[PDB]
Structure formats: structure tokens, C-alpha cells
Amino acid sequence: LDPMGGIVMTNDGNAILREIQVQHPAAKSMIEISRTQDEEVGDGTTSV
Amino acid sequence: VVSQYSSLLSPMSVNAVMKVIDPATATSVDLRDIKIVKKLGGTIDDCELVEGLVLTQKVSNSGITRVEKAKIGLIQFCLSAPKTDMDNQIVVSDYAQMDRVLREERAYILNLVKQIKKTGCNVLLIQKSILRDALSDLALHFLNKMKIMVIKDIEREDIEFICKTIGTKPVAHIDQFTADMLGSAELAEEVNLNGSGKLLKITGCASPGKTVTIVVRGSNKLVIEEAERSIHDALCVIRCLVKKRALIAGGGAPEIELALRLTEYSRTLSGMESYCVRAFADAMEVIPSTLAENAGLNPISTVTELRNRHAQGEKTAGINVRKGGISNILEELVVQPLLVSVSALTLATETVRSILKIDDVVNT
Amino acid sequence: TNDGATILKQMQVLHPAARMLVELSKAQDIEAGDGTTSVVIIAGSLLDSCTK
Amino acid sequence: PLSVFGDRSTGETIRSQNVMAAASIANIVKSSLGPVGLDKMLVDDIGDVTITNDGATILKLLEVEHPAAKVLCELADLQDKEVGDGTTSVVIIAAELLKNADELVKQKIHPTSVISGYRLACKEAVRYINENLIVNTDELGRDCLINAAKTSMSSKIIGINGDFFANMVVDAVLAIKYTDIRGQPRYPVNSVNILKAHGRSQMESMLISGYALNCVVGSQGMPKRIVNAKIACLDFSLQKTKMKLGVQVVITDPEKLDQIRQRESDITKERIQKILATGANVILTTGGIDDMCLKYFVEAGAMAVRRVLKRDLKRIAKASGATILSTLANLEGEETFEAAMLGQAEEVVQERICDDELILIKNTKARTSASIILRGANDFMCDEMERSLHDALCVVKRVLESKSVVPGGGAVEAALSIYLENYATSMGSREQLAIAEFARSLLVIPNTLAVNAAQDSTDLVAKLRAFHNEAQVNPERKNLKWIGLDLSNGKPRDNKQAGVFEPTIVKVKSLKFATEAAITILRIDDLIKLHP
Amino acid sequence: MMPTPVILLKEGTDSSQGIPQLVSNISACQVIAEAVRTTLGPRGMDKLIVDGRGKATISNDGATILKLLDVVHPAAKTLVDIAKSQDAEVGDGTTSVTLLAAEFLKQVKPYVEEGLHPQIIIRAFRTATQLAVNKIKEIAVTVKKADKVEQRKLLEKCAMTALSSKLISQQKAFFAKMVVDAVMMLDDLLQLKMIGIKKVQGGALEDSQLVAGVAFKKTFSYAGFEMQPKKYHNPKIALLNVELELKAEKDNAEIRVHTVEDYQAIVDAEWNILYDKLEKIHHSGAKVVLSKLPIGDVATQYFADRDMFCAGRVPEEDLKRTMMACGGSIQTSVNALSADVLGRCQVFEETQIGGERYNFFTGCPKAKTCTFILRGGAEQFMEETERSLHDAIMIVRRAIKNDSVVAGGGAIEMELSKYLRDYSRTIPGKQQLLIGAYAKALEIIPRQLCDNAGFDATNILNKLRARHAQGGTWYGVDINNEDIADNFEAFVWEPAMVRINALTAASEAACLIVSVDETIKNPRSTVD
Amino acid sequence: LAGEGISVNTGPKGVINDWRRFKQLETEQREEQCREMERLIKKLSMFLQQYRKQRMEEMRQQLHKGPQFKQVFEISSGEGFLDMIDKEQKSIVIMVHIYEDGIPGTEAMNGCMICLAAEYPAVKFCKVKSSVIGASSQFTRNALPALLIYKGGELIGNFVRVTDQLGDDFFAVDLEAFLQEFGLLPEKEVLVLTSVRNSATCHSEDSDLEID
Amino acid sequence: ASLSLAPVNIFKAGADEERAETARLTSFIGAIAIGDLVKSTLGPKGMDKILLSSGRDASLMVTNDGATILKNIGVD
């Protein structure tokens, strides 16, 4: 449930992790890892 | 705090004062002739006594630095498009007029720069301007192409100091800009302070003026401020030595001598004024007590020893901190000018007399 | 700082007598340039004697 | 009685408060020293995250209220600015000096005596370092530079990859060497443009034999690669010509308006044609380029890059031999562009780096430049890599400028402590104690190194001190001066043979700055804190 | 850290562990120590502490100061506890224990910061303390003569040394003689309740006196008391635990009569009961009557008619002291008042002391009790005088138990430091550093003495160290002469058990503080 | 009761420190009291026409692209609000949102600010509860949803009851257009996706310099 | 110096102290005010006063007696 009101239905790892807001900075590091993996090759987000 | 660096600072301050005055026929020192420049970084051991001037402004004409046999010129007009004092406009009603406007602006700027260059000038200082553009990019480019250092944003209040140091005469219009109104210098370079900033140094001036600049360095800002204050204290001491050239011992010797002699003077008097003068002497006896304190010595024993030694005839007997006791201080090289103790005594007595003539307080 | 004038003028003393002593230190700095602590100490001791 | 609108602290209270503040600052960064040190990870209460080991960065990000702690913070900043290494070491040394000096003061030793002793100890330590502990790099070759870079990068996120990172750093530094007047080869670090981009692993970081730009071509019609580039560096926007404030167009005959409007763009057309007629292939400008001039470049099949940063453009112009042109105006009042104003390079491309593109100017002629593209796992790791890389570059610059190095791993501190302890007996009576305390305080660095490794600090430092005492007593055992600490095994080791080196300037500047800060703080014995 | 939806401990639990919390504990102990730092030595200074109610307690005793401080730090309470322990077991040295413990902790703080295992420090302290105690027991001075004059002089010197740190130090010889006499008049157990401490406002310190007998304040005289004679020259005292007044026979008693004759008989029976008690007391030959329970106005007038003295509601401990001094027995019944249970004193008198009336029982030749009557200008003055006299009395009692003394002024501790350093110089070296730190920490008291006196502690300490090293055992700090002197020859004597207990308690506190590594504070419940 | 001409001497002088003690506190309090008074009371007393481009603006407004999407600054202290509005450069606009948890008309506003923050990095969108500021009872009860706008240290936005001209289903496009109608949103700037970053610090450049 | 006009405060909150000037001034003002109030009710042609009790009872009396006038007034 997007905070702007939309709904995102997916099993892609990058979108799911991007839509989540976290406070612990280690979680932020992991989310940035997901984003980097998505941008570099476009697959293997959940795997990484 | 600079007691450790005194071995460097004290000759520097003495030289600085002796540089800006005539050793004979001088009755005062204008300390505004000794400009203090504070630059963060380094240690106080890096303090310098540059005899030219130091400008914190950066060189606009990047790519050219360290000119030798410089002919510095100081200008007070602007190197930009023409602009009269009264409000002006240029009306264009033809494309040829547009082309001519651009061409004529270029030609005017080029003529200005060529007239500056024809005089042999190679360093240009430009006074700061607000209403009009002090230095257009076109003029800067032309100056660069003619191998001239350009240094803009010179403060108005620094013009007198710069002219007295370098020897340049300010030029407020291009018509009067001639060779005779230039300043000759041996070297004018920009030096970086090991990553702590860039200073512009003009060292070596034909017919140098009576000004010096002291560059203060330190690890942090607080010690630099304190070093500046201490250097100013040394300069003020030398100035006090310039006028009323008299010297007395330090170490609390004048205070204890005052206490003893004024005690005798009070004993020669009678009435309530005898008590008042006795109190005055006892009050003057406080500085030797404070000096004996703060040093680990016993204040009472040290003060009594001072009084006894001065009664014996030792006028120069004072508190010695190096040997942890009392001894002659003229052999400890602890001396101060007379117009320090005299001034302090006179001003303190005047202030006390003023305060004693007060008997009420009214809010407002 | 160790300068007497700087110490005195850097703190708001709020008392009229203290303000006049601050002005005294400033004047001593103007005429002499040092002894700013000594002059204030002398004035304080003089007034302390004036008490008795 | 005072009637001062504020708070006053006097005597041992303010001294102890200052010492506590300095000790707190030291203890903040004490855990990030040495190869067994570990990084910190700050949050800037808006979600921003900064993972770092650099002491200067940590102390700069933190907000500090106590004045003495501030003094240590700008000490760290100054040590970073003047040297670029040993920031944590100098902070720790200053705080330990302050603590021991305050203990001496509490023992009813006058602070001025402590200050004099500290000054004498600092001078003698610098003299002893310069006379006994220096190692010349002339007889070492490239190995000393490599080992210095590796030592600098230990304790950083690039420590294990030192075998590759040190080679890259040394090549980058040697690529930008220049000898100035008076024949002193200066190495202008900060001319190596560090570019970060997440993506491939650390080992895929590239050292560019040229220059790297973080900008792309302005139009998609232009070619993305030119083989023999003739770079034209400009410092003015290429847009429609607009009259200045002092020029105003007033039309009384309508027949001239079209000519005016046409000239408004034909002026820039003519400027572009003049620039291009010289054979220029790559045009870099600090200002902007509108669509018309972009199309003009497109038709010529030439590069055009807008909004180029001034420093990057200056570096490119210096490397390629081009001259920055803020305007087209010769000394004849005309508008011309000489062909000699063009730089050259062996290739200019727009490569793709993790779904993004950047421009590489490969193998510029008339000067060799360098740039490093760091590839990490995310932004934080790239930032820490960049900070560590800058530290290594500064260390290599210091080593190459002044050819003296000293062994690392706390060998210098132990030797200084032994020498100063033996030397304090020959100066004064109370400054003797001050110099002894200075010597004892100098031992904090090996102690922190050992503690961070979870090893027996007491025994290890005792063995180090015994080795250095034997070195300083027996004339024929002078090879033991290099015995430092090996943190991996927790045993003393000859660091000179091992390959642990530091610039001498690091130790000298750290000692001087720490002594000055300790003297500055030790002067305070009374604090007035006025109400705001 | 993660939210962990169901947290382990109760919310608000505070935990601290590792080296930082131990360093914090050491710092807290230092803070506690510096509160009583300036109270040590003949140049000591008193401290004023005001509680919430506004009452001020001026004191020089370290234990009192620490008790009045509301310490809540778990590590810092150990110093207060060991101060209380030293006060309880010995009664003197309540500041030395705190100074020694804090100095031990400060000296071993650097090694704690280097990651040294605390068990090694604890073992080093145990070894050093055992060695120091053995050395003290070996070198303590004792006399195998048991001379009464020598014993009295030794006790007087010990009392003077104990008293030469308080505001009564000007009259320390006077008060030491008084204390020694009072203690020697105790019989065999040296009970403190057998020494009375009376504080009367007004008058100088030299006006304070010790009564070889018992004395107490006049207690709520009834009507007719001023008609009784206030001086006797060989009275017999009738110590009673009896209510001598007209009252109901019993709480549950009830009288039922149906004739006016029986009514009059009952009234006369009550009066005759009271008069029978009074006549039984009077016929015993006693002249002074003391009762723990009240004595009514009827009895007061009855005794005044017979030229007798009566005083009811006498405090129980005052009655016990009177019994011990005069040699009678407290009687709950007056049916058998034989000469055995009647006290006897040479002189009884009621005199005025500072606006109050006090009853004096002097001339008792077999008294096993005393009564100090202290004078001063303020209530805190009498309280501090009483505290100082309590310290002196405890010291004198301990010296009575065993007359083994060591020189004061830090001489014993400098000797111990030299011995411990010499011992530590012959061991492998991990323990050597800690034992040397202990020996250096033992130097705190002479340094504190010099600092309080305004000396230069470093020069005096160097001179003391050289003197002890080159030969000489009892060289301490001579406060008056700004120098060092043989404190044994200067009669600065101190019972050995004082230093023994000080070292033992300080070592125990330091070991306990060092051992702890984690501090957990469960949240306060019912703050209210 | 006479002698009213007291002309007090030193009482106020002798208590000058204690008088300043609470005078400075009162000045600090009335600082935020006057800052808030400028908002309270005064406004509390009371087919191109169909936006063809609204949809397409909505789709390419979903261009977070970079790292995460961040959140509006939450202010939990009135002094925090005062010393952040007092500080910071006055060139760029500061927008403040007032809200109370639970009341409708809030989540849509927060989403609109979140979407607009990406569009305009210059703006300083932030939100704060009315409880901490010290709003009046009426303002808390029926004036909570308001877009406070500050620029240059003075009020530029005078908007309360934003739902009246926006409803409860307004999107970021609606709020952006409504604000641009009054010319308060700073104009957009051309932006490109950097790799991640280039710069590290700014100091003495010491660029390349070829010398003989 | 003075008990009240000293840098350290020696009083409880609410305690006061009036030195020679203020003590004499207050004493004279109070005494003169009492004298002027009770006077004008003196001699054959003196007049009376109205005493309104401010309490709940609001008792009312008119008197020429000086003692009764001075009794029923709240005097500080």
C-alpha cells in the first residue's frame, strides 16, 4: 500500500524492499544493496 | 600563553616597533602601522615579520603567480562597460547598431587594458566597487593575455596602508594612469600555508614605507587570538618605552617600595590623613602579596622579606619565581617602563576619588 | 585570555562600580597597554581599605 | 558580590571538567585505531547514514557543546588539513597529555612548570625522531611507497584489498607529478578526480589514464565517441544573444524588428561556426547550451557538454593543452578562435557505469592526468572507500615529497617514551616530572592498538619497552629501534622489515599539534559561562 | 538493537557493563572521597550539611559527613559502608579508610583501562594487604612492663593524637586527661552507656567538667518541690521504679459499695495505701528519692515535710548510672527497703548551669560510671564536641584492650610503602606493578596532610621517602615546623588496630568494587 | 499610606540577576508566542479545463529513481520549530504542515508533501502536531489541516482548511497546481540522474600545473 | 553594610528589614496617620465616625470615643 495511495502488487524483491520504510540503518544498507543489484544487472534481488 | 615562544616573539615585536618609527625625534607610536594578520594552522613558531604587506584577497587571474620586479598599480575606477554618473540608456533600432554596440564595448575595454599595460604595470590592485562592476570577465581575459596579475576587491580602508607600504599612488581615472604612479617591488607572489589557506605576499619594496605586517599562526583560533593580544601587549610596552623613556624594576619592587615609603610619609603626618595614607600604603602592598601567591610561595613571609630587604636599601629587590624566593631582579631581566606603574597608580587613585564622591543610586 | 581589559569587558558585570572599574581597565589599556590587571587590583584594594 | 549574569567554575572543578570533556572525545574515537580497529556508523536524525573510520570525519559530524572538546575537534580538522593522516592518533595523544598534565597539577605542580616540561619534551622528541628514527626512501624504490599506502589503508574498508589499491594509488599519484620552479617535484593531490558509483565489486575499480567527467552529452543526436578529439574548453554559455541592462531596443520603423530578432541568434550561430571551423570535436563549457546551438553541434557530428564544473574544466584544459576561453576576442578587437586553443586526447567516450553514463577523456596529450572510479556495494561503502582512498593519496604525497619515513605499529612512540624517560633526569626538577609524564602519555598509542586487538596490552607494551631500552642502551643493538607491534599475532616484530611505514611529517605534526592543544587547555583555571 | 515485541526485562531497566562502567565506578568513588578530603589532619576543616528540614550539621568526622550525604551510586555506597564499619569497629580513621580505598582505585584505574583482568588486581590487593598487616603487627611498639604511670601516659598521648583534628584541639590535653580518667573509672566491659554526655548551652569549653559520679537535669518538679533542701552531706539514695501518686489501684479494678461508711472506708483506704508507701520509703533512712515513674504532688509535699528530696520521671539510663555510681538497686516495690538496696553518695546538690538546674551526685568512691557536662555557645558546638570525645573514648578503650601503638603523621604508611615497594621489586612483574601501585597509593595520607596544611607535598614526600629508605621508621609530617620529624619521639601515637582495620576495610572495598563488571538498575516502583 | 514618591534605590538593582533570570525566560516564551500569534485567531475566527496533463503528470511524478523516498521532517518541540525557522537560509521557501493523529484529511496531505519533495528539493516540507506548538482549543478542534508557508523569515502562506479547496482525495498534482496558482512553489529545475555522487569536499584546489 | 542590602541574603522568603531612614519614616507616618484619624473628634465641637465592619456580620456603630475608634481598625 503506497503511502501516496496506490497499490503495488509484485513478487519482485526490489519493489517490495523499496516500498518499505525502515529506521534501523542496517536495514537501509540492505535496501540500498537491493537497489544496487537491481540497477546493475536487473535480476537476483531476492537472491542477493 | 606565549611565554615559551617569547624567544621568537619579543625580538619580532621590538623590530616591528623600531621599523615604523624614527628612533630619534619620535614621541609616539601609531600601532595602526603594524597590521596583524591571523592565519589558522601551523604553530606559533611559524609567526613571521614580513616587511611588505600581506593581502588575504585571492588572485583573480589564476594561472599567473609569483611575478618578479613587479610594478604594482592601484586603481579606483572600474574596468567594465562605460557608465556615466547620471542614469544612461543605449537605444538600438537597427541590427548594425547591435553589432556596433558589441564591437565598441570590446574596443573600449581593450583600449583601457592596453593603456594600463603601456605603463609597464604587471600587478593590478582594484578597489572594491558596489554600484558598478569592478572587473568584467572581458577585461580580466585581456589582462591575462597581457601577463598581468589581477587582484580585485581591495577594501577602501586599506588604501592608505597599501599606498604607505608599496608606494603606489591611487588612480581614479585612466587619464592620470602613468608610470610614475606605480609602486616598485622585488617580488609579489601567492604562497599557500600548507593547505591552511593562501596569502599574497609582496616582499621587498624600493623606498619602503614605515609599515610592517605580523603574520600570526596557531593550531586553533583561541591561541591565535591570545597570541595577537600578547603581541599587542608587547608593542604597547615598547610604545610606552618610546614616550617617557624611563625604566623600573618589576617583580613587585615598586609596589613594596611605595608601601614602605608611604608608611614613612604617613608616620610624618598627623590626624585622620595619617590613617588614610597608611591605608593607601597597605593597599599598595597587595601586588607583592598576589605575586607571592599564585607561585606557591608563602605570601606573608615573602612580603615581609621584601619589606625588610627594601628597608635595608635594596631598591631593586623583588619576587623571584625562577629561584622560588626573593632576590635582585635586574639580574633576572624583569623590567617594565615607568609609564605603566605611574599610569596605573594615577588612574586608580583618580577612579577611587571619583567613586568616593558618590552617595546615592537612582534607577532610570 | 589573560589580558585584564579583555577579561573585564568580556563579562557583563551588571554593577555600577564594576562597570567603572571596567572603564578604568580600558583607559589604562589606552594610555599604557598593559597593567590593566594591576590597576584594577590597586583600585579594589584601595576601596577595601576605604571600608575600614 | 560579582553580580555577573552567568555561571562561574574555578580551580580544580573546571580543570577536571575540561579533562573529562577531552577524555570523552578521545574515548569516542579510541575504538577506531589500528588494523584491529572497527568502523563507526552515524545517523544524522533525518535518516542519513555515514559509515566511517576517519577520526576527523567522526568529530566533524558530531555536534559538540563543551569548549575543550571543540578544541580537540578543530585539532582533528587541522591535522587532516595539514597532513591528511594520524587524526585519531593526534586526538588521543592530546587528550592523554591533558589527562596526565592535570594529574600532575592535582599533585600541586604549578601548570607553568608542566607547560615548560611539555614544550621541552616535544622539542626533544622531534629532534630524536629526526636524528634516529628516520628512514630514507631513496634506497627502497617503489616498495616503500607501496608499503606506506598499505599501512595507510589498513584499518580502512580497503585494508585486505591493499595489494591492488596501493598499486592503484601509487600509479595515480605518480601520474600527476610535476616539477615546479627551483626544481622541487610537487604532487598536486586533489587533482585526482574521485568518482563513485555502486555496482560491481571493489576490485573492479578503474584507474583512468586520463580524466573522468560526471556529465554527458547535451543532445542524443551527437556521437557518443570520438577517436581523435580536439577539445575546445569554453567558459561562457552558448545561447541566444541578449542585450545587457544598459542596452535597450526601441523600434520606430517595423521593418527592422525581424532583422533584430534574427541577429539575436545569428550572433551565436557565427560564434559556433567560428569555433567549429578550426576542426574542434569536443566542446566543453561551464555555461549552458540551448537547443539551437546543440543542433548546430549535432549537424557537425561533434561533442557538446554543458554545465561542466569549473575545476574539472580547468584540470581538463591543463591536461589536454587547451586554453580556457571566457570570450572570443583577440587583441585586434575582433572575434576569432585560433586553432592553437584546442586540446587533444587519444579518445573521448561516454561509457555506461551501472545504468548511468559518464564521459572519459582517455590519454590526453601534453600532460598525463588520472582519475579513479570506485565501485562498491552501496553509497555508504563508496563514501568510506573514497575517504580511505584520499587518506592513502595524502600519505603517498607526503612520502614522495619528503623522502623520510618512520616505522609504524607504535615503535616510534615506545622509542620516544624510553628516550624521554631517560632524558628527563637531566633537565630541571619539576619539568623533569612533566617530561616523564609526557613520555608516559606517549605510550597510549601502542596500548590502544593492543587493546583493540583483544590482546594482553600490558605484557606486549612491556616487551616493546624492553626491546627499545635494549636498543637505546647497547650501541651494537641499534637494529631494534624498528621493533613495533604485530597485531595479528600479538607479538613484537621488526616493522621496518615487515613493511609498516608512515611519513615522518605525520608524527612530527601530530606531536606539535597535540602539545599546543594541551598547553592551550591547561592554561584555563577559571570559566565564566554567561547566560544567553 | 531491535524492538523485540515482548521485551525480556521490565521496561525502563538500565544496564551498564564492561570497562566503561568500572571506570565510572572508580570516578564515583573519587567523587565520594573528595567530599571528606579536607577534613583530615590537625589542619582539617569542618563541613556543614543542611538536610531538607533546614537543620545544619557541622562536623569534622568523616563517617558523619558520609552518612549525611545522600549517596545513591551503588559503587559509591561502598565507601560510606566501610567508613561506617571503621567507625563501628574502631571509632577513628573514618576518613583514612575512604582516602585509602579511593586512592587504591585511582592507582589501579590505568591498568583497568588497559584491559587487565580484575582478578589479578584483586589477588595483588589481597597479597599486599596481608603483607602490610603482618608488617604493622611486627613493627608496632608495645611495652612489656604494664606500668600504671606509663599506661596512663600512653592512653593520654593516644587521646591527644585522636583529638588533635577537631575544634576542641586547643584544649586537647584537658579533654584527653578527662577522657582517660573517665575510661579508667569504667569497671570491666567499658560500656559506653555507662559514660554520660550532658550538653549545656553557654560557657566556655574549659568550663566543661567530668563528674566522678552521676548528674542529670531536673525533671518537671511538682508543687512544693522548692521547699525541699537542695544539699545533703551523706544522703542515702532510694532508687525506685514506682509510681508514687494517688491513682486507681488497677486499670480493670472496680469498686462496688452500697453504704456511705464503705465509701469513706474506700477513700481512706486509697489515702492509706499512698501514705503506707511513702512512710515505708521514709522509714528506710533515705534522704534522696528517685523514681523512673512519676512522683505526684502529694508525695512531693509529703517528702518536703520530712526535709527529703524527690525527683520523678528520671530517665532510665540516668537511673542506671546512678545505681552504678552509688551502689544501690532499682526497686519496683517498697516493701523491703533494706540498707543493701539503698545507694550512698558523699554529696548531693542541685546547682544551676547555664540557665538549667542539674542534680549532682559527687563523692562516690566506688563509682563505675561518669558524666560529661559539656559547655559551648551553640548546639552544633556541643554536638561536635560530643563526637570528638566519642572518638577519643573509643580510641582509649581500644588502647586499654591492648597497648600496641604506631607513630602517626603518615610515618607508618611511609614505612609500609617502602616495605611493599621493596617486596614488589622481587616478583615476576605482573604482580609487581600492582603491588607498587598499592605502595604508592599508601602515600595519600601524608600528601593530604601537607595539602590541607598548605605545604608543598612533593618536597615533604621526597624527604620522607629518603629518610625511610636510609634508615628511620617513625618519620612523619611535622605540621607546625613545615617539615618532617620523628613522630614517635613527638608523641604522635596511634593504636595499631586503627591502621590495621583501615587497610583491611579499604582493601576489601577496593576488591569488591573492582570485581563487579555489570550494573543493572530495575525501575523504581511507586515513585509517588 | 504616604510617601508614594519612593524613588527606589538599589532593590531592583540588587535583584537585577534574579529579575533577568525570569525576564529572559519570558522573552524566550513570547518569542514563539508571537511567532504563533501571527497564525492563530485571525484566520480561526471565521478539454483543457479538465486537466489533460493531470494524469500524465501523475504517472511521471512516480519517478523516485534514487535512494528510497525519504519522509517529511517531524518537529516534536516548539523550540525546535523556532530555531529551525530562525536559522537556515531565507532564499528558499519553508512549508509547514499542522496535523493531529486520527483526524481525516491528513494522510493525503502527507502523501502530497512526500511526492512534492522529490519534485522540488529546494523546498523544506515539514510537519508538526498542533499539540506541541501550543495551538488554541478552537484551532486544534476544527482548524488542524493547514499548510503553513514561510519564506524570508515571514509568512507567505495563509492557508487553513485546505480540505475546503482540496477535498480529501486531492493528489500531489492538485496541490502543486493550487500552490502554483498563487505563485508560491519555486520553479522547477532541469535535473539528471548522477551515477551516485562526484564531489567530496571543497578546499584549496591545487589542480594540475605543468611547469618547466 | 546592611542586613538586607548585602550580596548574600540573610532572611526567609517574605521577611523584611527597614533601616534608620525607612524605620523612622514608617513609624512617623503611622503615628501621624493615627493621630490625624482620631483627631477632629476632639473637644465640644468634635464629630463622630462610622465604622463599617467588613466581616460577615457587617456590624455598624457610630462613635466619638477614640479608644473604640482605634480598637476596630485593621492596623499594620
Ligand SMILES: Nc1ncnc2c1ncn2[C@@H]1O[C@H](COP(=O)(O)OP(=O)(O)O)[C@@H](O)[C@H]1O
Ligand atoms: N619574570 C618575572 N618575575 C617576577 N615578576 C614578574 C615577571 N614577569 C612579570 N612580572 C610581574 O607580573 C605583573 C603582572 O604583569 P602582566 O600579568 O604581564 O600584566 P598586568 O600588569 O596587566 O597584569 C607585573 O607587574 C610584573 O611586575
Ligand SMILES: Nc1ncnc2c1ncn2[C@@H]1O[C@H](COP(=O)(O)OP(=O)(O)O)[C@@H](O)[C@H]1O
Ligand atoms: N600492519 C600494521 N601492523 C601494526 N600496526 C599498524 C599496521 N598498520 C598500521 N598500524 C598502526 O595503526 C595505526 C592506525 O592509524 P589510523 O587510525 O589509521 O590513523 P588516523 O588517526 O589517521 O585514522 C597507526 O598509528 C599505525 O602505527
Ligand SMILES: Nc1ncnc2c1ncn2[C@@H]1O[C@H](COP(=O)(O)OP(=O)(O)O)[C@@H](O)[C@H]1O
Ligand atoms: N599532631 C599531629 N601531627 C601530625 N599528624 C597528625 C597529628 N595528629 C593527627 N595526625 C594525623 O591525622 C590523621 C587522622 O586525622 P583525623 O581527622 O584525626 O582522623 P581520621 O583518620 O578519621 O581523618 C592520622 O593519620 C594522623 O597521622
Ligand SMILES: [Mg+2]
Ligand atoms: Mg529473478
Ligand SMILES: [Mg+2]
Ligand atoms: Mg603585563
Ligand SMILES: [Mg+2]
Ligand atoms: Mg590513519
Ligand SMILES: [Mg+2]
Ligand atoms: Mg581522627
